[PDB]
Amino acid sequence: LSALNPELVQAVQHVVIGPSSLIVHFNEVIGRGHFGCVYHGTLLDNDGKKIHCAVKSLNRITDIGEVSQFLTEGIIMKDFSHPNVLSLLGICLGSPLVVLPYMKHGDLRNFIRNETHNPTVKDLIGFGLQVAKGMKYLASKKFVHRDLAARNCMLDEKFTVKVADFGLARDMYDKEYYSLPVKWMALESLQTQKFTTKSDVWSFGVLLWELMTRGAPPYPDVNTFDITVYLLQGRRLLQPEYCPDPLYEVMLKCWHPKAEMRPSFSELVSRISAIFSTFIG
Numbered sequence: 390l391s392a393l394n395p396e397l398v399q400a401v402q403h404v405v406i407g408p409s410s411l412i413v414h415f416n417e418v419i420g421r422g423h424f425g426c427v428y429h430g431t432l433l434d435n436d437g438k439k440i441h442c443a444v445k446s447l448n449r450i451t452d453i454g455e456v457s458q459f460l461t462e463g464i465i466m467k468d469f470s471h472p473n474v475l476s477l478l479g480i481c482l483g484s485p486l487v488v489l490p491y492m493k494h495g496d497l498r499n500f501i502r503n504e505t506h507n508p509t510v511k512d513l514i515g516f517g518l519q520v521a522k523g524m525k526y527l528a529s530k531k532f533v534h535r536d537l538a539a540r541n542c543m544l545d546e547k548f549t550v551k552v553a554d555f556g557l558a559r560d561m562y563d564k565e566y567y568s569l570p571v572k573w574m575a576l577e578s579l580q581t582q583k584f585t586t587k588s589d590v591w592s593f594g595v596l597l598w599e600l601m602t603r604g605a606p607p608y609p610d611v612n613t614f615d616i617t618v619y620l621l622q623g624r625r626l627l628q629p630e631y632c633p634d635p636l637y638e639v640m641l642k643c644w645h646p647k648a649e650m651r652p653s654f655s656e657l658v659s660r661i662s663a664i665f666s667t668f669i670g
């Protein structure tokens with residue numbers, strides 16, 4: 390730790406949570422192991438308010454070099470703040486810790502799939518709108534997500550959707566064992582392995598379809614190897630039963646083969662809020 394560059398240590402100070410400011414309960418995991426080694430934690434703010442947080446131990450980091458890079462992804466993610474983007478509370482420098490806010494209702498896909506929950510069509514569109522706003526912010530910062538899907542969004546106690554699975558919050562589902570999301574990828578990303586905000590617009594289109602089917606798997610009868618040919622033939626996900634026609638038109642524009650022809654996230658926010666506003670609640 391003393392081995393780290395001093396002007397780099399000074400640059401990460403505003404991201405670092407001191408050991409006296411955080412209580413990690415290493416005896417209690419969040420989400421029955423489904424999200425890896427993620428623990429309940431208590432973060433104390435400057436006024437001593439207790440913040441319930443989710444603490445992840447970053448076991449993949451060992452050497453000085455990897456610590457230094459992690460400090461940089463920390464500085465960068467700490468500048469991203471938006472009501473629809475999962476914030477980084479800070480980092481702890483035992484393995485490095487990533488401190489994130491606690492998301493009461495876990496991931497958006499699991500929440501909508503749960504038989505007990507009954508979101509209305511308006512509630513579902515509202516979640517889509519929230520994602521679109523989170524993405525509009527990321528795109529305004531020229532940040533390409535590359536893995537947008539309903540499983541990669543979180544829901545807090547106020548039912549506020551947070552775009553997650555990026556920066557230090559990536560590899561969300563990395564589970565330990567003892568012994569490419571091609572169905573969300575834009576057609577040009579499947580062909581070139583490159584990602585843009587226009588490829589994120591395609592993935593948002595798929596997430597919208599996931600929201601409207603309450604988390605059904607896209608293209609269940611099509612192999613990931615066959616997705617490219619299926620998309621080149623002009624075949625697309627079909628209109629979900631309870632999905633309004635103007636919203637399905639929004640999903641379709643998202644899956645246009647010409648990247649430049651797809652809506653921008655700013656346009657998607659405009660169109661979805663206009664659609665959301667036609668529902669009583």
Ligand SMILES: Fc1ccccc1Cc1c[nH]c2ncc(-c3cnn(C4CCNCC4)c3)cc12
Binds near residue numbers: 491495496554557
């Ligand atoms: F580990 C990560 C690593 C990187 C990014 C993101 C994450 C995930 C995460 C962050 N903050 C969280 N806060 C709560 C829950 C969670 C999981 N399950 N539950 C609930 C338990 C009762 N049943 C309904 C779900 C809540 C998960 C997370």
